[PDB]
Symmetry: D2
Subunit: 307 residues, 4 copies
C-alpha cells in the first residue's frame, strides 16, 4: 500500500524543469531528487516544496541519497552536463557516469523502471538496460517523445488546428538521423504531406517543417543556451502513461528484438506504455523512404555503440 515514488537523478535545467512539471501535474505523490550539486538540490527542493500546496493533489519533494531508491517505482536520469560545442568523447564521459549511477541505484535494491533523458539517449537507454540487468520492458529512453511533439506542433501551425488533433510521429535516433513518418501524418484523415504538396512551393514547406523539427534543439540552444521545457513535458507524459497504466502508444526509445527487422538496439519507435513500462513495440507500415531512413538510423546507432 505504498504510494507512487519517482527518484530524479540529475537536477540541472532538464531535471529541475521535469520536477516542476511533476509538481504542476500531480502524477505521483513522492519525488526524491539526487545530484552531485547538493546546494542546487537544497535550493530547488525548498522552492519546489513551496509550490506543492497548490498542486492538484499532494506531492512531497525531498533531497535524497541512493538508498532512497530501494522502493522507488521510477528512476529518471537527467544527469550529465550537456555536450560542449566530439560525439565519442561525450559518449565515453556519459557512459562512465551511467555505469556509476545505475550501479548505485541497483545496489539500493531498486526494482522499478528506468526512464533516461541524458544524451545520446538511445545509446544511454541501451547502456542502462545492459548495466541494470533489468528486462527490456523496464528501461525506457525518452527517445523521440519530444521530436514527435515538435513535429505535431509545427504541423498544428501549418494547418491551424489543436496539436492534440494532429497525429504525427518522428522515429529513429533522437538526433541527426531521425525521420518523419509522412506516410501516416494526418489530421482526422487529412493526408498532410499530400496537402502541403499542393501549396505553392509546398515541397519547400514539407522540407522546412522537418528541418525545423530536426534542428529544433540547435535553434533553441542558439537562442537561450539550453532546452528543457519540451523534454520535461515529454518525460512527464511518459511518467503519466506508466502511473496511470494507460496502454498509451507513445514514441519512445525502446529495445528492438526483431521489430522493423532490427535487433540489439534502442531506438525511437511507437510503443505501448503502461504501469509495467514498455508493454510492446508497435510495428507500423513504413514506405520505402521511411524504411531506408529507419534502417540507416539503426545502423548509425549500432555503429556508435561498436566504437
Amino acid at each position: 500500500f505504498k504510494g507512487n515514488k519517482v527518484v530524479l537523478i540529475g537536477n540541472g535545467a532538464v531535471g529541475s524543469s521535469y520536477a516542476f512539471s511533476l509538481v504542476n501535474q500531480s502524477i505521483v505523490d513522492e519525488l526524491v531528487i539526487i545530484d552531485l550539486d547538493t546546494e542546487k538540490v537544497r535550493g530547488d527542493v525548498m522552492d519546489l516544496k513551496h509550490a506543492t500546496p497548490y498542486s492538484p493533489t499532494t506531492v512531497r519533494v525531498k533531497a535524497g541519497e541512493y538508498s532512497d531508491c530501494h522502493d522507488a517505482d521510477l528512476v529518471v536520469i537527467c544527469a550529465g552536463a550537456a555536450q560542449k560545442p566530439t560525439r565519442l568523447d561525450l559518449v565515453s564521459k556519459n557512459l562512465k557516469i551511467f555505469k556509476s549511477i545505475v550501479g548505485e541505484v541497483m545496489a539500493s535494491k531498486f526494482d522499478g523502471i528506468f526512464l533516461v533523458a541524458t544524451n545520446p539517449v538511445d545509446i544511454l537507454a541501451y547502456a542502462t538496460w545492459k548495466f541494470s540487468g533489468l528486462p527490456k520492458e523496464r528501461v525506457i529512453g525518452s527517445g523521440t517523445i519530444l521530436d514527435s511533439a515538435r513535429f505535431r506542433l509545427l504541423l498544428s501551425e501549418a494547418f491551424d488546428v489543436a496539436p492534440r488533433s494532429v497525429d504525427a510521429q518522428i522515429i529513429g535516433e533522437h538526433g541527426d538521423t531521425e525521420l518523419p513518418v509522412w506516410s501516416h501524418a494526418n489530421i482526422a484523415g487529412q493526408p498532410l504531406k499530400t496537402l502541403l504538396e499542393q501549396r505553392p512551393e509546398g515541397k519547400a514547406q514539407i522540407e522546412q517543417i522537418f528541418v525545423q523539427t530536426r534542428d529544433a534543439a540547435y535553434d533553441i540552444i542558439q537562442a537561450k543556451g539550453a532546452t528543457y521545457y519540451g523534454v520535461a513535458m515529454g518525460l512527464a507524459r511518459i511518467t503519466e502513461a506508466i502511473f496511470r497504466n494507460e496502454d498509451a502508444v507513445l514514441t519512445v526509445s525502446a529495445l528492438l528484438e526483431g521489430e522493423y527487422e532490427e535487433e540489439d538496439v534502442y531506438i525511437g519507435v511507437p510503443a505501448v506504455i503502461n504501469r509495467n513500462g514498455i508493454r510492446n513495440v508497435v510495428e507500423i507500415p513504413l514506405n520505402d523512404e521511411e524504411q531506408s531512413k529507419f534502417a540507416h538510423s539503426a545502423k548509425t546507432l549500432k555503429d556508435i555503440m561498436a566504437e
Copy 2:
C-alpha cells in the same frame, strides 16, 4: 467569443517558470510573452511551444509586442532584474520600469486585469493601480500568495498531513513585516499554535516555522541564486481563480479602503478572486498581536511610498 489570453511581460526566471506552469495547467488557451531580451523570448517561446502538444487542452504560445495587449484578459508583470546584494534604489528603478510598461500596455487599448509579481510587490501593485487608472478590482499583486503556501508547507511537515488540509495564512507586506495568522491556523479545527506550544521547546518550533517562512526567499537565493517555482505556482493559482471565476479566497496584495482600519495602501490580505479580479477584501478577526503587526506592516509600506 474570444478565448482567454494572458500577456506576460518579463520573461526571466520567474516569468518563464510561470509560462511553463501555464503550459502544464492549460488555464488559458493563449499566452503572449514580451521582454527586452528578444533572444531569450525567441528560445523560450520555441521550447514552450514544443511542450504544448502534451498540454491537457490547447495552449498557444507566442512572442509578442505591446499591441498584442489590446484584447488581452490578463497582463502579468514579472519584469525588473532582482535586487542586487538599497531598497529605495530598487523602488526607484522598478517604478520607472512600471511607468513605461503600464503606459505601453494602456496605450494598446488593454482593458483587462493586471497581476504584478515584481518586487516590492505591494508597492508596484499600488503603482500599477495608479498608473493604469483602472478600478482597484482589476489590479492585483501576488502579495502573500507564496508566503501563505510556504507557511502551509512548513505546517504540513510539522503535522504530517496534506498541505491542502492545512488552513493557514500569512498577511501584511510580502517581506520583512509580514505576519502569521496563528489565531486561525488549523487542520480540520486543530489549533496548531496551541498544539505546538505543548511540544518540548514548542515555543522554539513556533518561532522556527515562521522564521523559515519569512526568510525562505533568502534561504533559496543563498542556495541556488534565485527563487521562481513557488512564485510561478502562486501566480498560476491566482490566474486559475480569475479564469475559472472561482470566488476563491486567496491571500493577495489588494488595495484597502477602510478594511483593517487602513486606507490607500496595497497589502497582503485574504480576498475573494473571480473573473472580475478582486471582488472584495475579506476582513478577518485578528488577535492583539496580529492587529499590532498588521498595522505596522501597512505603516511600513505607506512610509516607503512617501519616500
Copy 3:
C-alpha cells in the same frame, strides 16, 4: 468579466447525466437547469449542488427559467421524451419539432446570443431545425451528431487491438442513426491500418462487420438491457463543451451544416469539424474512398428526405 454559463434545457436521463459530468469536470462555473418537470429539477439541483464542494473548481448549479438565458454562453437541449417502441419516425420528428420551436423561441426572446448544442433525437434534424428557428449563424448551432458513435467505434477498436482508446484514431460520420458509416480508410493506431490488420485475422471480415454492427446498434443494445442510454452521450456533450470553453480548435465529429463540403448542401450531418470558443470554426473535408463516398451521400440524402417529409 462574466464567467462561463451553460443553460441545460431538458433534465431527463441524458440532461441530468450531462449536468453531473459538468460537476465532475468543472468545464464552466455556472449551470442553470430548465425542465417542465420542476420537481425533478429541484431534486436534481440540490443533489448536484451537494457534489460541487468536491468539484475541481467552483461550479454553481441552479434551477432556472428562460430569462436566465439572456447572458448564457451555451444552451444545451436534451429535451423530449425518447422515442416509444412502435412510435413512427415521422411522428417523433413532428412532436420534437414542435417542442424545439417552442424552446428555441423562448430562448431567443431572452436576448440569448450564444451557442446552441443539441442532443435530442433525431439530432441532425433537430440541429438543422435549431439553426432555422434561431436565425443564428451556422457556426453557433451544433448537434452532438456522431461524437458518441465515434467514441463507440474507438472503444470497440481499443478492445480489438488492446490499446488506450485515446490512441485509436477512428471516426464515424453521417447521420447519427441507421445510415452512419465507419471511415475505415483512415482508422488507425499510430499508423497501423486497422481494417487491413483485421482482414488478415481468421474470419477477419466477420470481425470488421461486427465492430461496425456493434457501433451502429449500440443504443439499441443498451436500451434493451437497461431502458435508456445516457452516460456515453453526456460524456460526448461534455467533450464538445470543453472544446468550446477552452477554445481548443479541436477536431471532433459533430453534426454540422454543410454548404458545399462533401458535395452536399442544406443539411446538418455528422462530420469532423474544428470546434473553438465561437462554435464550429469549419467543417474538415477529408478524403473518402468509394464505399465511404457512396454511404455518406446516401446518409445525407436520407436526412434531406426526412426533412422534406416533415
Copy 4:
C-alpha cells in the same frame, strides 16, 4: 506493476453514479461492476465504456464476478435497496447485515487483500459490520460517513456567505443520520467565525438553525423531490477514492473505527481522519465545545445502541 483496480458491488442509482464519476475523473484505470441485476450491469457497462474514450486517461470498465476481487485494490459497496417508507430501522439493518455478510464473505474468499469503502445505509453500522465480517485491520475499512453531510454543510455555508465552497472549512461529524452535528466551533472562511457572523444578522439564530436543518434533512428533501439521492454521495465516494489512490494524507470526514479517540470505543462514526493509500492512517481528534461534546457522545451512544439491538 499492476494498475489501480476498483470493484463496485451494487450498481443501482448510487453505484452507477459513482462509476460515472470514476469515468469522468480517471482516478483508477480499471473498474469492475458486480450486481445481482446482471442486465442493468451489462447495459451500464456498455454505456460507461462508450464514455471512456473521452476520459482524461484510460479507464477500463467491465462486468465482473467475485473472483475478479482477487487483485482488487478497493471494493466499494453500494448494494442494498434503499429503505422503503414505513419499513422499520431495525428491519433495514437486519436485511442489510445479511446482504453484507454474504457480499463480504464472497469478497474475502477471492483472496482480496485491499481496502473496503462502504456507502450502503446505515453506513456507520455497515462499516462496522464490514470490519467485523472481513477480519481486516480498521485502517482498511472505511464508511463514507459524513463525507456528504460535510459537503452539504459547506455548500449551504458557501451560499450564505457567497464564496467558493472550496474556501469554506466546515464539518459535520457523528452518525450519518438524525444524530449528526455541525462543528460550529471551527466552521470558518479564512478565519471568519461563521456562526458568530450569522448571529449578528437579523433573525440570525433562525439562519443558523436552517443551515443545519437543511444539511441534516437534505436526503429527505431530495427523495421527496425525485425519489432517491445519488450525485452527492457518488462525488463523496470519488473524493475518498482519490485520497486513497493519490496517497494524499488528506483530512476528510469519513466513518472510522474509534478506539479511544473522543473518549469512545468500539464504534464506527463520522470523524475527520487522514486518508492515504493504506486507507485511514489515523483519526484526527479535534477540540469540541460543550455542545459538540454532548451531541457527539449521544450520536456514538445511539449507534452502539442500534448495534446492540441488532
